[PDB]
Design a protein around this motif. Structure first.
Motif, short mmCIF file in Angstrom:
data_model
loop_
_atom_site.label_atom_id
_atom_site.label_comp_id
_atom_site.label_asym_id
_atom_site.label_seq_id
_atom_site.Cartn_x
_atom_site.Cartn_y
_atom_site.Cartn_z
N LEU A 18 0.71 -1.23 -0.02
CA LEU A 18 0.10 -0.07 0.00
C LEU A 18 0.91 1.17 -0.04
O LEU A 18 0.40 2.16 -0.67
N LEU A 19 2.14 1.17 0.83
CA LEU A 19 2.92 2.34 0.84
C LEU A 19 3.64 2.68 -0.44
O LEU A 19 3.46 3.75 -1.17
N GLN A 20 3.93 1.53 -1.17
CA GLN A 20 4.50 1.76 -2.58
C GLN A 20 3.36 2.06 -3.55
O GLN A 20 3.81 2.94 -4.46
N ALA A 21 2.19 1.54 -3.30
CA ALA A 21 1.21 1.84 -4.34
C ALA A 21 1.03 3.37 -4.23
O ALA A 21 0.50 4.20 -5.15
N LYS A 22 0.77 3.91 -2.68
CA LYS A 22 0.59 5.32 -2.42
C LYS A 22 1.74 6.09 -3.20
O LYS A 22 1.36 7.29 -3.65
N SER A 23 3.07 5.69 -2.93
CA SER A 23 4.16 6.34 -3.53
C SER A 23 4.04 6.48 -5.19
O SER A 23 4.29 7.85 -5.77
N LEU A 24 3.46 5.40 -5.89
CA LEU A 24 3.36 5.56 -7.23
C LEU A 24 2.22 6.52 -7.43
O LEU A 24 2.22 7.20 -8.46
N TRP A 25 0.97 6.41 -6.80
CA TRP A 25 -0.25 7.37 -6.99
C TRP A 25 0.35 8.58 -6.70
O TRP A 25 -0.13 9.37 -7.50
N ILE A 26 1.09 8.92 -5.88
CA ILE A 26 1.48 10.39 -5.51
C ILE A 26 2.47 10.75 -6.76
O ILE A 26 2.32 11.89 -7.26
N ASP A 27 3.14 9.85 -7.26
CA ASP A 27 3.99 10.22 -8.39
C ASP A 27 3.20 10.45 -9.65
O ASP A 27 3.43 11.49 -10.16
N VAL A 28 2.08 9.68 -9.62
CA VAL A 28 1.34 9.94 -11.05
C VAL A 28 0.73 11.36 -10.60
O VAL A 28 0.31 12.12 -11.41
#
Lengths: 48, 49
Positions: A18-28
């Protein structure tokens, strides 16, 4: 019992997922806001 | 794999030839005594007569 230990570890693993997906979502989101800023800049240049 | 394992954990993990019949005979016995298991086993395992 090892699978229950895997479940205990997987709680942290899914938390990391979830933290990595949140990082990818914030990058997006950063890419999208920068694209919106570029769209505003191109809109200003188009208005000029 | 974690979500699949979670559903797998929901599934039970890790003979009973005449257990139900012997148990039902034991429950309806109308007898106050020892009622040895050998009697129940010989009664519930005839299969011929």
């Amino acid at each position: 019992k090892l699978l229950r230990e895997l479940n205990q570890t997987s709680d942290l693993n899914e938390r990391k997922m979830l933290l990595q997906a949140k990082s990818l979502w914030i990058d997006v989101a950063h890419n999208t806001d920068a694209c919106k800023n570029l769209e505003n800049e191109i809109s200003g240049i188009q208005q000029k | 794999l974690q979500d699949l394992k979670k559903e797998i954990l929901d599934s039970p993990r890790s003979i009973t030839s005449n257990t139900v019949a012997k148990s039902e005979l034991q429950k309806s016995i109308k007898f106050s005594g020892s009622i040895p298991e050998i009697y129940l086993d010989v009664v519930t395992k005839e299969t011929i007569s």
